[PDB]
């Protein structure tokens, strides 16, 4: 038994997944193997202890979420996001990216959405002039409204399987920490690159004047929220080599 750390094995397999005799795995098989490794991942595998709620309100001085960088190549990024109590990663997309996440401690509510896409056989409609929202929309925001669907809204814990998204399915999500702090490992491929036109866009669901899922919604892109930001903090777990 000469095994590497689980995080090193996760990183290797992500590298093979997202990048003659005998034939080595294809992408579906490699993705399924990656997901099998992520199912085994515990917070203790990363030397991260669970965090319990702090009682003081979160002042503007402090970030609601922190990030621990683990590894990245041009194929994928590998990190941990740690959410304080009562905080959220607001609704955002992953343009042309695959993603996999695994809760390490706590509980999160993940709301999974998609913009309606004519490449998927949908026929996205323009926002009709009649319907209105609270708050009302400025005219040019009306022109930017895009139809979407809210697919699911479930709670995940470290006992749940990994949450997977693709470039065209569950590509938008919001992550709420439920009843205390929470953390999750995230794999994204390719990584974001704000300087090469692959950005994290934020969105809001419009409130127009049945709670059943799935349901159609209207989505409006929005700037990163004033009070949402995510600063780094030291990663304490095993190093990914080199
Ligand atoms: Fe995300």
Swiss-Prot record:
SUPFAM superfamilies: RmlC-like cupins
GO MF terms, alphabetically ordered: cysteamine dioxygenase activity; iron ion binding
Covalent link location (3'-(S-cysteinyl)-tyrosine (Cys-Tyr)): 200-203
A single GO BP: cellular response to hypoxia
Catalytic reaction list: cysteamine + O2 = hypotaurine + H(+); N-terminal L-cysteinyl-[protein] + O2 = N-terminal S-hydroxy-S-oxy-L-cysteinyl-[protein] + H(+)
Residues that, per the record, bind Fe cation: 92, 94, 173
Catalytic activity, EC: 1.13.11.19
Entry keyword annotation includes Iron: yes
Keywords recorded for this protein, A-Z: Dioxygenase, Iron, Metal-binding, Oxidoreductase, Thioether bond
Ranges for region Disordered: 120-144
InterPro entries according to UniProt: PCO/ADO, RmlC-like_jellyroll, RmlC_Cupin_sf
KW Nucleotidyltransferase (keyword) present: no
Cofactor field: Fe cation
Enzyme class: oxidoreductase
CDD domains noted in UniProt: cupin_ADO
Pfam families: PCO_ADO (PF07847)
Its job: Plays a vital role in regulating thiol metabolism and preserving oxygen homeostasis by oxidizing the sulfur of cysteamine and N-terminal cysteine-containing proteins to their corresponding sulfinic acids using O2 as a cosubstrate. Catalyzes the oxidation of cysteamine (2-aminoethanethiol) to hypotaurine. Catalyzes the oxidation of regulators of G-protein signaling 4 (RGS4) and 5 (RGS5) and interleukin-32 (IL32).
Assembly, per entry: Monomer.
Name of the protein described by the UniProt record: 2-aminoethanethiol dioxygenase
Provenance organism: Homo sapiens
